[PDB]
Amino acid sequence: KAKEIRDLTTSEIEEQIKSSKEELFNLRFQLATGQLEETARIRTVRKTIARLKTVAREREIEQS
RNA sequence: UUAAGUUAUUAAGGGCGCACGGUGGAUGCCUUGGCACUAGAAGCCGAUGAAGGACGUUACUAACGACGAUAUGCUUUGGG
Length: 64
Ligand SMILES: [Mg+2]
What we know:
- This is Large ribosomal subunit protein uL29.
- Belongs to the universal ribosomal protein uL29 family.
- This protein has one domain.
- It is built from 3 helices and no strands.
- It is mainly alpha-helical.
- It has helices at about 1-5, 10-30, 40-64.
């Protein structure tokens, strides 16, 4: 996903970070009520956040 | 039949021998871990916050290992 993330702009990555965190939080609430049934989405969204934070961190270090 | 003698039988339990079981973990075989060394490298890190820890991180989860709110992991370069 990193190659696709690198095509996004800086404002887009922040928006992706916010939206991914909302999705993960929604998954956690569904899991706590026994409604999820798709538990592999949790790990997938968590790693997407990790990739998104990595690309943002690289750009700031690179520019600085 | 009497009289006078003699000597068995019984095993409540026990003894010796044998047979078959149990308990127990010796012995044999085995090695996951140790012990003594050889050769080469290296030895000591820390306010750019150490050594050592606490608490957390997996869909479910107690403990250990790995990891640190990017958490049972992220990127990249090579290997496969
Ligand atoms: Mg008897």
